[PDB]
Symmetry: D2
Subunit: 347 residues, 4 copies
Amino acid sequence: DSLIMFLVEIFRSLFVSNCIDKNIDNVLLSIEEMFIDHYYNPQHSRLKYLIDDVGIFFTKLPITKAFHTYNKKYRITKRLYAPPTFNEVRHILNLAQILSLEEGLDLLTFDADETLYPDGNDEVLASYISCLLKKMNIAIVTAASYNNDAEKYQKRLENLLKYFSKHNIYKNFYVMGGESNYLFKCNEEATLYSVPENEWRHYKKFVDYDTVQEILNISEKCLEKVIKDFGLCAQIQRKEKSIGLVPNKIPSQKNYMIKYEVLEEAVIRIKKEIIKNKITAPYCAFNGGQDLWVDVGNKAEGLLILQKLLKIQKKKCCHIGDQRFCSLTLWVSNPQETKACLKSIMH
Amino acid sequence: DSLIMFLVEIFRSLFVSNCIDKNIDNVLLSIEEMFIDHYYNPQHSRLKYLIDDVGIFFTKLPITKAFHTYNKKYRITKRLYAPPTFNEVRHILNLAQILSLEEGLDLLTFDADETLYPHDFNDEVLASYISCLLKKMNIAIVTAASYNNDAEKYQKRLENLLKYFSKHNIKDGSYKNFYVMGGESNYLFKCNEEATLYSVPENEWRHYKKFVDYDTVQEILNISEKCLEKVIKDFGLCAQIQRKEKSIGLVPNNYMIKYEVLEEAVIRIKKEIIKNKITAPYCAFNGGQDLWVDVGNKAEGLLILQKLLKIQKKKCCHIGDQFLHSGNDFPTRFCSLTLWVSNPQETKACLKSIMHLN
Amino acid sequence: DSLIMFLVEIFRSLFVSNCIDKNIDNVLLSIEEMFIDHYYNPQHSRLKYLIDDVGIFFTKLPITKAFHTYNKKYRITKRLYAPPTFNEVRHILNLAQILSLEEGLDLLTFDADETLYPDGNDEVLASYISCLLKKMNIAIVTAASYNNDAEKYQKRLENLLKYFSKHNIYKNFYVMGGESNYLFKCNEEATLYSVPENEWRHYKKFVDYDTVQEILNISEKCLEKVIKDFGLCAQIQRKEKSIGLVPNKIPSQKNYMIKYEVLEEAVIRIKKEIIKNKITAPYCAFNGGQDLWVDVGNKAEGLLILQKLLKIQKKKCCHIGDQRFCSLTLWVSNPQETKACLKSIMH
Amino acid sequence: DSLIMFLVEIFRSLFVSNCIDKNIDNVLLSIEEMFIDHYYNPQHSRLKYLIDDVGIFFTKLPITKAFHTYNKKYRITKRLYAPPTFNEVRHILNLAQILSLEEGLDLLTFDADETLYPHDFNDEVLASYISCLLKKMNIAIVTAASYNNDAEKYQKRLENLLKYFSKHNIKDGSYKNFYVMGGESNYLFKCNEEATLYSVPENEWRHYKKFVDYDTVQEILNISEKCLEKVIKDFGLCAQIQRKEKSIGLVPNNYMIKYEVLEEAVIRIKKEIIKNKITAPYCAFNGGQDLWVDVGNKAEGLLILQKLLKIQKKKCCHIGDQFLHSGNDFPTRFCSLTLWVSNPQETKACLKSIMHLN
């Protein structure tokens, strides 16, 4: 991330010049003003000249207030031998984006790929998530596709729903499967039903069936090449609007393992070949540590569906994931961070 | 750490020139010839000029065969968009060091703290590998944990592995060839037929350990005590200080402590200890959520077993997980063969590869 | 230059792996094939994936033959402590591009900004340039504009023409003023006349007069801002299709000096502001160490004029300058290098 | 070289954060406070920790005033697309070192080889600056050129500057306060009323120069002679070897030699000389088209004048052009104040700024 680096180099220079524990507010306010000017002029701001991939700011980032708030609690400027690190500046930018939600947020989305759990939960999470549900809409997005088989989505994340049956009552909880292709809701008794197409068919970006089938054919061709090239013991699974690469199960249980480097290569191979056919339709190929899934859809399309379905402005939506231009983003990497951010959001 | 990065930068240029999946043997052989010259002339080798902190090669290293063998199993050179990574070159140098044990392997030492268990030992697969290797050679387990020669405390985290020896490795007499060191290089133990850890008096083998005055031991503990007390007040910690003989540490109450706070305090301790020009052996070990300062280093502990068991330096190998410059495994590169590792799964793999004696 | 760096990193790894003085031909041939594949597929080659700004190859670069030829003469691989440097790899790429001219070259162009002389020549140059003129067309390009006043172009480079009056006889020598706006030729007796517009008016890229006047107005506004901001003692000079920033003359001779850093800033300021008005017309702002000149034109337009006027394929044109996609380029920085390259071209 | 890069990296971050043209005094003052602590405690300063080869600050450095004054004259902070460059920070540290001469300047030394003339001295403006400063303090000219105490040869390249002293600086008696050193630190000279360079016997001031055995002098010359002979054959040079007493060099016949060939040969000479553990003073000076090895360094030469003229270390300043790590001016940072320069134009500028005594 060039935005985090950008700040890391600056903090490193203040640290090595021996004034980082002094009053650096003159530098922080000059940085904050560049952020705010980019908020009004995302296309031609000077911040755009420094960071080409800066993206878009839906909020006025209070980075100065975030630095003081982070420094007071963790006291990183008292360090004499290690300047602020990449991971620490990452939490500061999360805090700045959390703090920028002064007007409140009505939509909160969770990337449930790996950030939330390795397998099937956390009660402190479920307790914190439930508190937020009464305040505003929440949503959970999965890259796995089981078509519309609602029972399969429940198996991967059933424990958190058990808390919701108690201490709730409500209808402000949503689950998105296939990245942006299947949207479910919740009734009363430990539920998992699918909203009909009429409620959200128009909001989905229009794509042809043959175009959808074309992407899966291209991805199917690449994975076979990946399987044969790296000699993996794996099987390909094609679905309606998705295709996935899964490892073989050890005969007897537990499944075999694919090296993480090979999965990262296949994602680049698939993404590159899709661009070769000049396909403009939305798509995404996600690596889940042990699985590879290609969906005809992306988090951006699914995020827009929820904003348009629930009539929420983009400034009131927030996303938490391990990995764009349509919602505020918090970068985490473990469930404890997800609960750590959610604890800060409670105010 | 820098030898690995040395190879990563080279393989990156081969990948980038589109020839890494071709025959790169002329480059690899030139690298191997440099490893041979460092093996023969460690003090003024060409490799020492390129890499100052390279360490000592106690054996000739088949780096070409390792790359060739590792590529045949993992096909890393078939990748179009990812050059050989840091961990893959790490695995390559691991196998090259294993293949350099053609002469034999008399002693094998493992880090207790993190290469064997998350903590409580609870891996039946790992211990089943350990028993077979134990039959053919002596093994030892080195921990930074410090209990003042209390064999009951050390056996707690290692109960299952020791209890395994009773059912499979008790009759063959292999139990005598198993040792445990506590406080890095302060308390040595051994096993009996009842699968229990018993003690060996520090007076029995103090001839092999460089003595340190009791006042200088307490000197190091008091300097560290001041730094840890200053560190707690500086960052507003919730943790407390626990002191024992020949060892002091920072322990929470359990509130997790940030990694950066622990790492700098190691630097402050090491920097302030240097300010008094202390030449005694010591180490500031950074744990997951704790910090510990011991009088004595793993290098001294590994030297004791070599002198005690009369084992040759080239026949001794060590398996540690923290081979970073700040880690306590970094100095052990000068007294034994070393295998960088990260978890039991990787440790069981290196042990599986080691079980090809021939 | 990313292409030169690209090779410097590779040579550095061969050097540090202690095999650079051995047979590195396996690496060089793999590099050469990437160059050749980029020659056939400039838009989607793998070299394009490694070097985004690689440009275009009008020739099959014999980089392997260039390395051996450069190594045999200078013996750089016998070094034990310094790998091949950026400047050395630069000469190799010049040699490779010179060697690629196996089918001969009919056009040779010289960037006369600073590469050829600081002031008004070199007889060894003039002797070498004259030998090439009988073989093929030569051309000299200047950023300075004196409209069509041919006498002023002659004053800056009159000494080389004195050699041409002797040992010649002919009509294959050309001079381009205003980057791409004024084209002159040579008669018999120490000459400097201008070819009429009809011979080359159609080949110039069509641009409106008000558009040309717009660029000079924008550049005039920037230079005044540069003058007032940095407090320079300088005067602005506007012309028909150019505007320049010149320093004041010390009263009494010799002229004042502008710091080189300020001139480089004004070029970026002018170029940036021209893009702000979305001007698509060709232009260039050149820094000449002591002068700044903005021309409505560029070396690319002038190069195309000479190729179309003289009916020469792009594979037979070569340019020598200190600083694109329409001719082969040799990178030099001093007159001795220019004569050094020309000595190699004589075969 | 690394202190300059230290400031360049800091100013780059200030420029990038859009506040460099605002008030950056809090950052600059923190930098100045570090320069004061290094001035007081050079051995274990915080600045030495960040920059290991920083050198010695013989005076407190007004780095803020230098930046403020330099910005007022050149307005570098008004640039939108170019942070302060390497040479601008160099000029800033030059002025800060000049402004640190508030106490006085008794001795000023110039590199003859390249800070005074392209070579033949031929700048009337430079010499006219030299005469005025010569009236108020002693100046000296240090050259790597080696002629065995032949005053006629040294005066050739310096004729115009010496002849200028006869017409303007001969009556005031200032001629006595002007010295010339040859062979870096081997032959000292002086001037008379007739504007001629006369010699001073090396026996007269050998008490100030650390003696070196004649066999060890020839030892260094023979080691260099082997390297240069090997270098010529290695790269197929056309040059030849010229040897004198206490000095040896590589000279063409005049075919220009590549810069990289000269620079590595300096490394080979320095590396091989270190291999014999020679502690004598020496230097391998890289010229434009030649290479020279002298027995004795500029640090020794600058030390002689301080001990001979009894001048204080802080009152001595040096003006050299090659302050790179490989250059011969690099060691002079530990015995005198230093001003990095590149040509007479820059040298006349520093001399012009120096003419504000007050």
